Design an enzyme around this catalytic site. Structure first.
Site, PDB file in Angstrom:
ATOM      1  CG  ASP C  42      21.330 -12.483  -3.059  1.00  0.00           C
ATOM      2  OD1 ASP C  42      22.250 -12.620  -3.902  1.00  0.00           O
ATOM      3  OD2 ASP C  42      20.452 -11.602  -3.151  1.00  0.00           O
ATOM      4  CG  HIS C  45      19.376 -14.316  -7.012  1.00  0.00           C
ATOM      5  ND1 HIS C  45      20.331 -14.187  -7.999  1.00  0.00           N
ATOM      6  CD2 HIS C  45      20.056 -14.442  -5.848  1.00  0.00           C
ATOM      7  CE1 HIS C  45      21.535 -14.239  -7.457  1.00  0.00           C
ATOM      8  NE2 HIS C  45      21.396 -14.393  -6.152  1.00  0.00           N
ATOM      9  CE1 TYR C  90      20.842 -17.497  -8.168  1.00  0.00           C
ATOM     10  CE2 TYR C  90      19.896 -16.858 -10.283  1.00  0.00           C
ATOM     11  CZ  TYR C  90      20.995 -17.011  -9.457  1.00  0.00           C
ATOM     12  OH  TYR C  90      22.242 -16.665  -9.913  1.00  0.00           O
ATOM     13  NE  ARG C 162      32.552 -16.774  -7.942  1.00  0.00           N
ATOM     14  CZ  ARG C 162      31.328 -17.280  -7.818  1.00  0.00           C
ATOM     15  NH1 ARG C 162      30.934 -18.261  -8.627  1.00  0.00           N
ATOM     16  NH2 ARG C 162      30.492 -16.799  -6.911  1.00  0.00           N
ATOM     17  CE1 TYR C 164      28.800 -15.560 -11.747  1.00  0.00           C
ATOM     18  CE2 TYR C 164      30.264 -14.031 -10.613  1.00  0.00           C
ATOM     19  CZ  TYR C 164      29.341 -15.061 -10.571  1.00  0.00           C
ATOM     20  OH  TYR C 164      28.951 -15.579  -9.356  1.00  0.00           O
ATOM     21  CG  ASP C 193      29.720 -18.757 -13.323  1.00  0.00           C
ATOM     22  OD1 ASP C 193      28.738 -18.983 -14.063  1.00  0.00           O
ATOM     23  OD2 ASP C 193      29.738 -19.035 -12.102  1.00  0.00           O
ATOM     24  CD  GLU C 221      30.289 -22.700 -11.029  1.00  0.00           C
ATOM     25  OE1 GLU C 221      29.726 -21.849 -10.301  1.00  0.00           O
ATOM     26  OE2 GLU C 221      31.130 -23.523 -10.603  1.00  0.00           O
ATOM     27  CG  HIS C 246      25.571 -23.215  -9.324  1.00  0.00           C
ATOM     28  ND1 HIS C 246      26.143 -22.716  -8.172  1.00  0.00           N
ATOM     29  CD2 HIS C 246      26.030 -22.446 -10.338  1.00  0.00           C
ATOM     30  CE1 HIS C 246      26.917 -21.691  -8.479  1.00  0.00           C
ATOM     31  NE2 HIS C 246      26.865 -21.507  -9.788  1.00  0.00           N
ATOM     32  CB  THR C 297      23.544 -16.980  -2.974  1.00  0.00           C
ATOM     33  OG1 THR C 297      22.654 -16.163  -3.745  1.00  0.00           O
ATOM     34  CG2 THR C 297      23.403 -16.604  -1.495  1.00  0.00           C
TER      35      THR C 297
HETATM   36 MG   LIG Z   1      23.142 -14.361  -4.747  1.00  0.00          MG
END
Ligand SMILES: [Mg+2]
Ligand SMILES: [Mg+2]
Ligand SMILES: [Mg+2]
Ligand SMILES: [Mg+2]
Lengths: 387, 387, 387, 387
Positions: C42, C45, C90, C162, C164, C193, C221, C246, C297
């Site tokens: 990924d 980002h 990222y 989960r 967001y 999150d 998170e 993270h 990710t």
């Molecule tokens: Mg990702």
């Protein structure tokens, strides 16, 4: 007044030291025909990957197209939204934002028929004292050559230098000893720059031995690992000399201020995202009653002009600064390079609207490069800027 | 382009609440005929002494005469040198610097034929949400009248208010209860302002009981004594609501940032020395990733216009602000007052060069006062702005 | 045994949510004919720029050519030297290192005729419990669709999800309310999150209201801005629930450990530089007696296989993890995707040497993309992974 | 592949200094006929009690029987469950776990037909610089003999030594003075080891006087009582030289990292539980950006080979290490002892699968001892390793 197009011109220009850096010259066009020029300075720093300029032009146009160049706060917010601060000294996104923002300053000033100086708060001084860089010695056999550099640059008017140290303390000390011996007090080495290479205690040891040589020493720079605020603070308490560190993100600066980790904030447009971002950092430092030095990545005349205007507008620069790019690079992309005299960088003619610099299309063609691709180079060379 | 003369016009203008404030309108003349207008807002705050304007004009001229209005950084440095920051909310020297600096912004913008908005970084928004003030109740019998104020201002478009509390919690709570009862959710009281009247623990008790009423509450302001950073911090940890405090000096702001003492920095030109100083404070807050609200001392249209331009250029104002001076004062000194609609303060016409405001000489004469002398007033009245 | 060549295959694969991500499949060839496959997961980002793959191949070959694939520590040191950690979630350089390091693990394991599982310390478990992601609601009208996702995935075996949150608390709360209403206790939402979107105090407010709904909640998170260790710590003291964050760089992890800022370290190969770097981070956490969750990710089967092997070797994963990439993407580049059953991610067949996955050349061609260029997308979309 | 049996062979081997240490050689048998050999090094440290080996074999078999030797994480978890870390430098349970874990590494490597080096991350170097130990002087009359040791070992290639100090500063200083006098700069004493004998302030006094002699001094080791993290930290601030301390448990290491108490982490398999545990500690140090030195309890060739493989795989060993057991002991239990040349310990032949060492059954019989019982010895002798 609106932005209609954008041009990104990649160039490669070698230094007298042999190191070759790639830069990107920016052109921002408007509906009224006014064009702002800018510079995304020195992409030749780690990480070892390169940015696709065709894709970048599209991304940037998407952001800028149709906007009012005078909306600096709005535009910089959107630029930061797309190119986030990373807490890393050489984030390429910062170089990118810088080129766009300084081009916008040039554009706005041209439209108003004033120098960028008067668009940034006027002047406090007409020139700023700078120093010529002596890159770090990894070997003792590199000393002689560097002594000639000092001899030559001094004759040309540069009486202040800065020395990158940390790799070979014996070599560092050999150089400092030779200089003091040959020039007495004629030359000053305003800073010993560790480039985040050593942990603070080792730096303390190095500082203790190197500071035996004080030739107008003004500061010790980056004497701890990147973002090691605690280490910088402890070193600040153990060192009589001021401790200076580069500002590469607002978060990083906030933390160094919160912890009173340093004495001098080394602020330079390229590492923080442009003139707008550098002004914010400089004002934050002022609010914190902290000293500031104008740092550098060593840029061409376009980028050096921009920083010269900002530099001459600040009230808290009380030490020698570092931008000497146009003296270090063998070529440039302008009709007339910024001027250096007696070790001072002069702010461009205040009577000339804009940055006070003019691109030379023939030189842009001469130094043109197809992309920002990397050539054969080692990590040591990228860290020390040697070849 | 140079400054040739200065004029200071003292005026007295009553509020609808009955409180009478004295202001000073500034005029800065140049050799080219361009004049910048400014405002030294609300001198009617403790300490109980007044500044000799004849002497002040001489001192200020001594500083400004012959200078280039575009040298904002240089001039502001000299202004601060002569009128040092004191760590006091109402230092008259700050009001003075403010009048000079906003007049310089007006002047520079006029010269460039642009709005002050475009001299400050453009716009992020065209208007800013504000709130109408309800001054503190010292007695329960003061409630009814204040409820009518809410009823009346709401009908006029102000759906957000702020309440000064601390003197009489029973009265504070009676008001909040009545409002919620009569208007339900139609009205919001975005802030409970203690005006540094209580120690933090007492404020905590008050906050705990007052916050039983949450009508779109956004922040608790000045819930600790002036400069009690430790108290603000402890309260910030015990309060779910954001804690806001006025910025009256860079040292004070630096300390609140160092200690992470608050959540929202209430920044207003008049208390920090002008647009230039307010921008520095706002940028410091931005660098610190802190929220900002545009505060006020309640100024006339000249001062409100200046702050409206700054307000609309900031990217970190995410709450309701406070400047409603032109709505609070019965008179003004301009041809057309700043505009308020639906509880929003609009930035002056971006097409009009300068502040976008015009003085009305007949009104300057009408409200003229011989000096800044004090009339009969009590400490409670000066603290609460009541009569 | 030495490396002789490298191949980088760019692909674009849409998700069922509509978001399209670009990945790079890696092939590392040797003199003995053994090839290791890897994945730089990924790249889609922020920052909004893309890496030139032609230049990258040259830079990476320069590093890898002629080296012994078994020299993992040496190679990873050199990889980090050229692609420094930046303290940014990222950093594309981390994705790059990750692809190379997991390809090296595949290569070494193949050479030894063993599963990567046995090259990483064997197994502690055969599968790891994971959760299906429900991306953040910016609007209330997005709820219904997300409820169907839950209904559908639950039927397929995913009983843990989960969520967001942070953009629209009303929408967040509407969703949680609907879920509890329709599924009772059949479904668990193991994490809320915030994605570093809110300052800790605002997060505290949000946490307080959202935690009214506890459907097997395991952690909160990223409830603070990136690198806000002080904020994470304060929140850890005010929250009963474990706080997870993270790990994007060793410096960042060291600081969160030094300050005891969190309860659970969310470790994932892609964000830290590969299996080698993730093992170091996981061991650091173990030494610090800290809980670990396998983050993601959202990668393809090659990347998911690699992390499944690491995940099943760790002794400190006591909560539900997040890698569900192969279930989220509409396509893949392998003959047989990793397996998910009853909400568990199974480690590849331990009998199959290497990663236990096989590339499908026809699928590599099918999803091939000329480069990592960006398409039209907004900042909100990049932050939320929506389309 | 499963474990079927275990053998524990106790041996007693005197040193050239006269001190006699007891060790236990490990053999782990499998169903496929492959056997891993290991070493539970130097049980001859306080506390003054001994472990029943008949009972230990039963306990260990209970744990290992039937397990897959490749399940290193699982097995080490179970080993730690039964032999908990105690925060004590010489916990016999750590020696026990160490012997089992290094035997498992030997076993796994043999099965894969590779050197343990390639099972640990390959190599960063082929040999590691070590130093020969000079045990502490309790009396001045012990100096002469120790000077001969230096003279003799230097001639044999050991130009770097380490000195145990603290009991008699006059004697310590007499030695250092004599050495500098007789060898000038030919010999280096890389460390002054206090063995946790003094409180930090007394150590500071001792350090101040002893450091008058700097013969390539690299660090001061264990200059504070065991687990006195605050003392180590204060000393780290008052000492220019790096401060080093042994890692005997993860909790202890976590705390020294949390408090930034030291500069160099002295890591050795025997004191932390084996190669698996030492790798975790070394990686934790790497994540913390801390320097590491390979410590020792002075082991036989089996144990020294194991640590040599780990040592050559680490990227953060930038100082002289300590394992010189095979040079210190008069006998060994292998066909060919590990090799030392020019003061460097060489990693076993990378071409030889397993540890690269081979047991000599005749030597195992020769040095066999019935148990780990203690002989007549004093506390001073056990602390100083003298006879
Ligand atoms: Mg990702
Ligand atoms: Mg540079
Ligand atoms: Mg006022
Ligand atoms: Mg021992």
């Amino acid at each position: 007044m609106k932005i209609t197009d954008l041009e990104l011109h990649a160039v490669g220009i070698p230094r007298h030291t042999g190191f070759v850096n790639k830069h990107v010259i920016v052109k921002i066009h408007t509906d009224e025909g006014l064009t702002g020029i800018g510079e995304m300075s020195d992409f030749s720093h780690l990480p070892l990957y390169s940015v696709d300029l065709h894709d970048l032009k599209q991304g940037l146009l998407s952001i800028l197209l149709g906007q009012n160049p005078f909306d600096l706060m709005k535009i910089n917010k959107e630029l930061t939204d797309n190119f986030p601060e990373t807490m890393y000294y050489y984030e390429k996104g910062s170089f990118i934002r810088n080129g766009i923002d300084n081009a916008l300053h040039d554009l706005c000033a041209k439209y108003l028929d004033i120098s960028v100086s008067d668009f940034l708060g006027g002047r406090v001084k007409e020139k700023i004292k700078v120093c010529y860089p002596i890159f770090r010695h990894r070997f003792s056999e590199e000393v002689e050559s560097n002594l000639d550099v000092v001899r030559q640059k001094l004759e040309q008017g540069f009486d202040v230098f800065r020395l990158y140290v940390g790799k070979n303390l014996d070599a560092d000390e050999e150089f400092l000893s030779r200089v003091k011996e040959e020039f007495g007090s004629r030359v000053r080495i305003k800073s010993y720059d560790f480039s985040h290479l050593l942990n603070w205690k080792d730096a303390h040891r190095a500082i203790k031995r190197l500071t035996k040589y004080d030739l107008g020493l003004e500061m010790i720079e980056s004497p701890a690992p990147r973002n090691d605020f605690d280490g910088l603070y402890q070193l600040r308490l153990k060192t009589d000399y001021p401790i200076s560190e580069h500002v590469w993100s607002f978060k990083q600066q906030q933390e160094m201020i919160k912890k009173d980790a340093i004495d001098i904030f080394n602020i330079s447009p390229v590492f923080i995202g442009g003139l707008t971002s550098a002004k914010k950092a400089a004002y934050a430092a002022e609010v914190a009653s902290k000293d500031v030095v104008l740092g550098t990545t060593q840029e061409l005349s376009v980028g050096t002009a921009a920083m010269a205007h900002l530099g001459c507008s600040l009230t808290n620069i009380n030490h020698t600064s570092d931008p000497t790019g146009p003296e270090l690079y063998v070529g440039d992309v302008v009709k007339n390079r910024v001027t250096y005299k007696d070790g001072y960088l002069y702010a461009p003619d205040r009577s000339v609207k804009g940055l006070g610099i003019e691109l030379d299309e023939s030189l842009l063609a001469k130094y043109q490069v197809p992309d920002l691709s990397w050539d054969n180079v080692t990590v040591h060379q990228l860290q020390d800027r040697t070849a």
